[model samples]
Target: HHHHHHMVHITLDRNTANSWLIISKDRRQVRMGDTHQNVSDNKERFSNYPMVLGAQRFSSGKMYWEVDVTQKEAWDLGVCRDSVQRKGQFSLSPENGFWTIWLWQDSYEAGTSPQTTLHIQVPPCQIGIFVDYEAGVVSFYNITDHGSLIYTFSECVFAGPLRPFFNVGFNYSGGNAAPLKLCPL
Candidate 1:
């Protein structure tokens, strides 16, 4: 009935009040905020080939979360909840599923352009995100392409792990999509 390049199955078991749980490639449950955590690497790129799941959002965020992925370069595609308008949501780049750039808006029906843009660069990239109250910021770039960056913001987190949900959509430049999956710890 349905097919995917790569399927990532992750489950989040409840953690301490201030702690979160993460699933490894082997499906090992580990605490967030630990030393350094890593997700599975199927090494599949986007081409209608491999589908990667980044993170999961169990409940809404009241404060904020900032994840810095400087160890490895990767792509992140997901939905974020608007803490400001309370009814705003949007998609990552190439909103129509054809474009190569990243984009976002206050709502699903909003016009494009107003969407932000990031500089693209070489491979082995790294980026950071500041999940604020209403919108979340995802900024990354290739370390080899001479310094290019890709950035985006949204208001929905992981629709569900069963499906694509709200995780990052995989698609790499250089004719090869990234095979790595990323999430906040």
Candidate 2:
């Protein structure tokens, strides 16, 4: 068994830009990429990456996670089967401030998955998101979305094997920025 107790820290600099980062104890299945928000029915501007985290399906039923989201553009966070190929649910963002925190459930299959999409707003800023998964639930909170309960899943379970490959993606359709990292618990 492996223990995921590492923190992925990211800082959105004023001159340089960073892409999403997918992590896992393994190395074969961890991936990160950009996500598309265009209303196209084609596969050109879809999700990227194959698998994320270990190749084995998450069976522990409990985990912890956090991500520092500094977007030059608008973006959302979510958990999709494999990459963005499978449609996932979008998490809520707190518009009262610059960033938001989500703490809910990261359920899969017959439940909910944490997914996010950039919103159309005025000036884009940086965002930090933190999450803690325990028991059969995955909770997410904004370092700033008002600590809103972003998502909750009832029967959430990993869909694949526990390997070294997990994918976290960002889709910046036509914005001036991108997601810095996509860290897993």
Candidate 3:
């Protein structure tokens, strides 16, 4: 019975974000914008994927955070290795540095090697991601269901520093423009 977690304020790294993402001034929100903004072509930035990482890095700890996914039909939330692939075709799974879950259309799926389709009575509007570094566990919870368990990645080998991973979905042109917001603590 544990409800305790770090639950600290986390933010996005501007350098790691793709130019098309609009990171809020407070760095607490990320959304897909209609136009790509001007940014430096650096190795740290994403070249093809529309994703971003957290500014804070975690090596070993049990931490928790929530994201408000309202107004978006598609999005992704989870953790990934700091040195994940960014410039090419990469699969989203534990094998490829990403330990994530996604919402596409009306379906929910986990980034398993063969992909796990999760079935729930109700879709989650707010998702809480919990990671136990030493235990190699990443759990996803539905805040809308009073913190009900959604999915968990167990026996994971987080070999390096982990960062909060985010993606605003592939819905284009005012489709999934909702900002994935940091739920107010």
Candidate 4:
């Protein structure tokens, strides 16, 4: 169960972050910002969704990373293709270039085209993501729940590089913010 070799050092990239997201000073965490901060308007910045991508990109090979997701009303954690849309209202789905797991009101779901609902007894505190680019596969693990398999996206198609993606910013509802942090393997 050694994932050390496949681990990828992933960090938040403000360049690709939305204005509504606040990247931690150390660039390791991201959370919702009630007010939008002034950032350069560019193609890399996601103008619509409050999602931020990682600085690291992989064109080919196996890559693994983990994110600390707290109990919340809603949040998203996963990876997306580099060519994903950045400037418009788009659906979060694998066909739309995203492979993600979502937590909504104590409900766990996979970001499939049809939105697959998941049932689990134990909640995940640290989610592990393992991507086999060559095989076009992405697997999610519940690190805090004994590294049990959460969900796996299979038969994916990667034309180019894929980047770690995080969708945050739900504190507006709960009024107390909890940032998602990237932990090194």
Candidate 5:
């Protein structure tokens, strides 16, 4: 089996962002805002979750992207199926159509069906996500630590196109306020 790495650009889809989530004008960065904005409620917008989807979607091929999570207290990043439930409270697991890696209070977790705990001497500030659609694999790399493998989800069954997913966590105050920036290749 051969893998060819291909870089892809990702940006937040503001329409899918929660009202309290602040998305940059360029849509490449998302942060927990100090105050919630008066935005119209929609079914697609995440009400109970502080999450957002990427503007782009991929159905096939190898895709890779990087995210800068410096100074962020909590966050989740990975890919989700297009059919993932967008309304109300939902589980962040592969069975629910989401395959993600999360960072919270220096702890790392892979959002698998039963979840997996990852050990790291130092927290990572930058994370690289690589997904091979045909191979049914999604891997996370600690880019801040010389591109070390943090975790990998294998044998994933994609029902449809996948989109980049992100969450700044539940902290809405000054804490966890750092922006999650999507890095350019």
Candidate 6:
């Protein structure tokens, strides 16, 4: 039997974005601001975290989305439970309700229990994220190489709605100025 895959267009939730993060007017792109902005404090906002959540939430079923990290030297993208803590500093690992893959300084890592490092000869300009909530799987692909598998997080347990997550990593003299854009289907 052949299965058809469906893609989802995700938009950044400004309310969940960090104060220093700049979200595009269309809400489809996010990037680290050159300077921090003075913003009001809110429970939903990440005070010390450099990340954002998607506007859409999924409790079940399969979801797929792609992000353009071409111009960025460091970034993190994946899924996280809606209940995941948004306050203060916390580990972006599965145990903390975050399932993500990161690229920084020419290195890639999966946010697993022990954290797994991924080896990719060629850096990916576009990264694809595939999640099967019911199946307990979250996979990452290097779309620049015809959807080559980068890493997979299997046997995941979703305690609540899953939302797309993004982090622009750290800003090194505005090195991470490029936006992490959600690709349009």
lDDT per model vs. reference: 0.28, 0.30, 0.87, 0.84, 0.86, 0.85
lDDT of 6 by residue, 1-185 (tens): 01116688788998888999989899998888766767776888877867889999998888888899977878889999999998767888888999999987778988886878898987899998988988999888888887888988888987889999999877775677788988888
Q: Write the per-residue lDDT of candidate 5 for residues 1-185, one digit (tens) a residue.
A: 12225888787888888898888889998887767877888878888878999989999999999999998888999999987888777879988999899987678889976778998776888888999999999998888777888888999998899999999887744678788999988
Segments in model 6 whose C-alpha atoms lie over 4 Å from true places: 1-4
As a TM-score, model 2 comes out at 0.36
lDDT of 4 by residue, 4-35 (tens): 48887788888899888888888998888878
For candidate 1, write residues 71-150 as lDDT tens digits: 22232333332121111243333232211222222111112345544433333333222222233322233333432434
Question: Candidate 5, which ten residues in sequence have the lowest lDDT sum?
Answer: 1-10
Q: Pairing residues by index, what is the TM-score of model 5? A: 0.94
Candidate 4: Cα lDDT at 61: 84
The TM-score that candidate 6 achieves is: 0.94
Model 3: per-residue lDDT, tens digit, 20-84?
A: 88898999998877777877678888777789999989998789888999878888899999989
In model 3, the Cα lDDT at residue 66 comes to 89
Q: What stretches of model 2 exceed 4 Å from their correct place?
A: 1-57, 72-76, 80-135, 157-176, 182-185
Which segments of model 1 are wrong by more than 4 Å? 1-24, 27-55, 62-76, 80-115, 120-124, 133-178, 183-185
**Cα deviation of 35, candidate 2, in Å:** 14
Model 6 residue 102 CA deviation (Å) reads: 0.3
The local lDDT score (0 to 100) that residue 30 gets in candidate 2 is 24
Q: After superposition, how far is residue 170 of candidate 3 from its true place, in Å?
A: 2.4
- Arranged by lDDT with the best first, the candidates are 3, 5, 6, 4, 2, 1
The C-alpha RMSD of each candidate to the native structure, in angstroms, is 14.3, 11.7, 1.3, 1.5, 2.0, 1.9
